[PDB]
């Protein structure tokens, strides 16, 4: 009685655009509308063998033979111009609301039980905690992934756009807010309650985000990469391409969307290792390890099935986790 649906799907909220890159000079950042784009190029590289050898020390002559015929490749690269010292990244973000309702289902009683559970959660607390964490992740420029590392001064700027003009502006220093904890500040709380107003269905919101990063003249920036499947084997010439929309270097949307939802601090292992991005069996590919293994009863699936079918709530932080996973959206069914 009252099993799970066989097919069940949720649309995502918090839709970002793609990020566009451009360069210019610091202290001209207030007039940055004609800043030229950053273009990708090509250059050649010759390198030698540098990995571990399969057989360790049984053949030195093979090592010398591999040295005397090195490897040649063509590689894409993106740089700042040699007279500008500031990167500019701009994208827009759309918040939707209507979080509980799936887009596909089988049983009517299942989805009725589901959305009344979501109504109980939204009656207990608002979206204020999740919106606070989202506005915190937007405060620091975490979506600059490698371009944040070793920067000198990085400052973001958010506008609220209702008609064709701006309602309210914000400014921050992204190096004041660390990537480690979630504090409080009145501007951040005003932004967070705007996010919570958007998430509740109480009204639409549209924001545009612009981040500046002082790097240095002629240094290297980092867009997203692409697929070079079955093309680096016959001659191996082209071996790395960057993503670019209409000859300007760009970041994928889902990389920014992955950077936004790194709010999960409640995974059972530790807390001195910082927040991670939400996921069923919340995992990090960079470490090859999945927190919230299904053995411990702290993954998404068993938590949801316990909350809906056996009708007991988990702890309130786990309710934050399962609601954030529903905000992320995806396909949840029998596979």
């Amino acid at each position: 009685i009252l099993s799970t649906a066989s097919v069940l799907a949720f649309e995502r909220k918090l839709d970002p655009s793609d990020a566009l890159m451009s360069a210019g000079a610091w202290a001209q950042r207030d007039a940055s509308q004609e800043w030229p784009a950053v273009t990708v190029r090509e250059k050649s590289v010759r390198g030698t063998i540098s990995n571990r050898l399969k057989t360790k020390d049984r053949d030195p002559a093979k090592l010398d033979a591999s040295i005397q015929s090195p490897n040649l490749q063509t590689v894409d690269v993106a740089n700042l111009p040699s007279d500008a010292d500031t990167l500019k990244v701009r994208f827009t973000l759309r918040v939707l609301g209507g979080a509980g309702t799936p887009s596909a289902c089988n049983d009517a009683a299942y989805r009725d039980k589901l959305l009344q559970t979501v109504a109980t959660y939204v009656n207990e607390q608002g979206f204020a905690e999740l919106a606070r964490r989202y506005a915190h992740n937007l405060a620091n420029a975490r979506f600059l992934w490698r371009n944040r590392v070793g920067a000198e001064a990085v400052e973001v700027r958010i506008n609220h756009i209702r008609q064709g003009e701006v309602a309210r502006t914000w400014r921050f220093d992204a190096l004041a807010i660390g990537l480690r904890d979630f504090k409080a500040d009145a501007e951040l709380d005003a932004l967070a309650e705007l996010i919570a107003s958007g998430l509740s269905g109480s009204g639409h919101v549209l924001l545009e985000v612009v981040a500046f990063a002082r790097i240095g003249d002629g240094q290297e920036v980092f867009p997203s990469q692409e697929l070079i499947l079955d093309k680096g084997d016959k001659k191996g010439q082209k071996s790395k391409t960057l993503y670019s929309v209409r000859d300007a270097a760009a970041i994928h949307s889902q990389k920014i969307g992955n950077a936004l939802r790194t709010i999960d601090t409640w995974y059972p292992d530790e807390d001195g290792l910082g927040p991670i991005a939400v996921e069923p069996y919340g995992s990090v590919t960079s470490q090859g390890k999945a927190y919230r293994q299904p053995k411990q009863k702290l993954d998404f699936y068993t938590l949801l099935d316990n909350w809906v079918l056996r009708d007991e709530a988990p702890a309130v932080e786990q309710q934050h986790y399962v609601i954030a996973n529903l905000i992320r959206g995806g396909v949840f069914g029998e596979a």
Partner: peptide, 28 residues
Amino acid sequence: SRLPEALSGCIPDDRFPYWLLTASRPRL
């Protein structure tokens, strides 16, 4: 399946009647 460990880039001359070269191009 392995290299005979004593090779070093050579061009054969008339001093010896037999040489053992590799098949790769900058021969040893």
